[PDB]
């Protein structure tokens, strides 16, 4: 029941900020991505004892063998962070099926595969915490981001469905729904109540919070700065 967390997509952006923050808190992190060179660089500045792995979460067995490497080198994974995702803006009319299937398997199906592989370990230990990084556009939608919205709206119902299913096994699943994160904004940042774009470390603090809160599951924590009130 130690402090070991698996952060998929922890080489860049939010997932990288999540790994950075949990390393300062004393967690044993694993930085997972496709580009292993990026994962190593991320887990390199994360202090020491942190490992890096290569995995395409859109693949059924790629994530399988990645978890058996996790279990083998880090041990039981107590915390799962699904921050792996892709985004290519474009109109639905100007979006070929290949890109539509691509984002779906990465942003949605990918998180379903990872959460599934983390089950039998967390189930046998009767303890585990999962946070799936989504978006505000996954719920409220945004123009030119239909495919991304579907993929990010899907794992909201998924995380909740998994929550009611595994809550009796002392396992919690939550969703962080960030808004505009800094990583164009002039006629947009003025709208937001806080008057600025967010930071990856600010989103990361929300992620860690959901993982450490004992009575929170199936909840969608929004980190937007009041954007959802005007979006």
């Amino acid at each position: 029941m130690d402090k070991v967390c698996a952060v998929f997509g922890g080489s860049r952006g939010i997932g990288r900020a999540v790994a950075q923050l949990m390393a300062r808190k004393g967690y044993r992190l694993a930085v997972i991505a496709r580009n292993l060179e990026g994962a190593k660089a991320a887990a390199g500045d994360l202090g020491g004892d942190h490992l890096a792995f290569s995995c395409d979460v859109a693949k059924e067995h790629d994530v399988q063998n990645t978890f058996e490497e996790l279990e083998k080198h880090l041990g039981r994974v107590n915390f799962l962070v699904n921050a792996a995702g892709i985004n290519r803006d474009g109109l639905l009319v100007r979006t070929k099926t290949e890109d539509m299937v691509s984002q779906l398997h990465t942003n949605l199906l990918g998180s379903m595969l990872t959460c599934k592989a983390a089950m039998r370990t967390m189930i046998q230990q009767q303890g585990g915490s999962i946070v799936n990084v989504g978006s505000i556009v996954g719920l409220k939608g945004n123009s030119g981001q239909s495919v991304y919205s579907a993929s990010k709206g899907g794992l909201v119902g998924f995380s909740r469905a998994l929550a009611k299913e595994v809550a009796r096994k002392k396992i919690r699943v939550n969703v962080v729904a960030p808004g505009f994160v800094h990583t164009k904004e002039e006629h947009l940042k003025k709208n937001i109540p806080l008057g600025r774009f967010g930071e990856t470390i600010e989103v990361a603090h929300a992620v860690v919070f959901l993982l450490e809160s004992p009575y929170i599951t199936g909840h969608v924590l929004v980190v937007d700065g009041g954007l959802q009130l005007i979006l």
Binding site: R168, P193, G195, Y215, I216, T217, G218, H219, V222, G225
Partner: protein, 246 residues
């Protein structure tokens, strides 16, 4: 460790005499925040302070005069406005819609909704006047989102709290004042001891975690919202229901 997370904060907590408000006071003080424990009960607030420099206050949040008086008592004792404001002051007068009297409606609304408005308004005024940023935390309920039998007045008030806080967050964003709502499920408090045991058993079976929450669980989210770690979170409803009515 988080025991220095709120070292520089002055926290005002209404309804700090019992249940959630008391647990909130414990957690905030446990993180270095000097707590201004307020409550309708004079002794309950003082005993809360005793469990925790700290100070106790008495006020009826439902009354406008007592609300602005409370904030003035705080700014006089600590020579500063409270950077953290938590509204845990609330009551319950359950009765069916068909049989709910006018008084049972008026009192719950005044305490839970209007009482929360006055505190939030007076808190913001004290922070804007001194040019001090802050975080306002209103303790709503999961009932405010879906409603509950016998709690028409309670659900209306709690739902009103959310829209209230959402409005405040959008208006006070320019002054660096974050406003958020906490939506807790069923928690082992004196308020929960009011409803019959037979119903408590059914609820526990409905809760995905299969048990009532602890008041410390609610304070855990309040402490986070009061911190700088949620410095980009405003106008957001946080749910602590154990999955109940997700």
């Amino acid at each position: 460790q988080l025991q220095n997370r709120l070292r520089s904060a002055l926290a005002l907590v209404t309804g700090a005499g019992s249940g959630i408000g008391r647990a909130v006071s414990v957690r905030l003080a446990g993180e270095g925040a000097t707590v201004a424990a307020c409550d309708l009960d004079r002794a309950a607030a003082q005993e809360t302070v005793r469990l925790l420099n700290h100070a106790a206050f008495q006020a009826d949040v439902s009354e406008a005069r007592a609300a602005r008086c409370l904030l003035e008592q705080v700014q006089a004792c600590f020579s500063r406005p409270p950077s953290v404001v938590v509204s845990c002051a609330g009551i319950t007068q359950d009765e069916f819609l068909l049989h709910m009297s006018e008084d049972d409606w008026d009192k719950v609304i005044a305490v839970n909704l209007k009482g929360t408005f006055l505190v939030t308004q007076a808190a913001a005024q004290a922070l804007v006047s001194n040019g001090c940023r802050g975080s306002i935390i209103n303790i709503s309920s999961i009932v405010g989102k879906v409603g509950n039998v016998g709690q028409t007045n309670y659900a209306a008030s709690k739902a009103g709290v959310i829209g209230l806080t959402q409005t405040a967050a959008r208006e006070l964003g320019r002054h660096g004042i974050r406003c958020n709502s906490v939506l807790p499920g069923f928690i082992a408090t004196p308020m929960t001891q009011k409803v019959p045991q037979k119903v408590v058993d059914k609820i526990t079976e409905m809760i995905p975690m299969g048990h009532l929450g602890d008041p410390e669980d609610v304070a855990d989210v309040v402490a986070f919202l009061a911190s700088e770690d949620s410095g980009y979170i405003t106008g957001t409803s946080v749910e602590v229901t154990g999955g109940l009515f997700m």
